Amino acid sequence: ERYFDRVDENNPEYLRERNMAPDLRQDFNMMEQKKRVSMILQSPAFCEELESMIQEQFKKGK
C-alpha cells in the first residue's frame, strides 16, 4: 500500500508535486542543478567588485 503510506492532503508542499507542468518540472531541477546563486556568492573575485561598485555608486549619486 503506497496509497495508505502518504496522503495528498496531509502536506501542501507535497501537494505541489501533483500540480506541476512538465517544463516547470525541468526548470526547477536544472536551475538547482546549476546553483548559479551559490556560484556568484561563493566566488570572491567577482564578489567584492560587485560590493564596492554598488557602494561607491551610491556614494556620489542616486
Binding site: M39, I40, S43, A45, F46
Partner: protein
C-alpha cells in the same frame, strides 16, 4: 632583440617604416577562467 623594440617604438607614433619584424606581435584581450563565465553558443 634590442632593435625590434626600438623600431616598433618608431612605428607606433606614425613613422611609416618598412622594416620587417622577424617576430610578429599581437595585442589580444586577456582570457578568463572564472567559473562564472559561460561559453558562447557558436564560434
Amino acid at each position: 632583440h634590442e632593435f625590434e623594440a626600438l623600431m616598433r617604438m618608431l612605428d607606433n607614433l606614425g613613422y611609416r617604416t618598412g622594416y620587417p619584424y622577424r617576430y610578429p606581435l599581437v595585442q589580444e584581450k586577456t582570457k578568463h577562467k572564472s567559473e562564472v563565465e559561460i561559453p558562447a553558443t557558436v564560434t
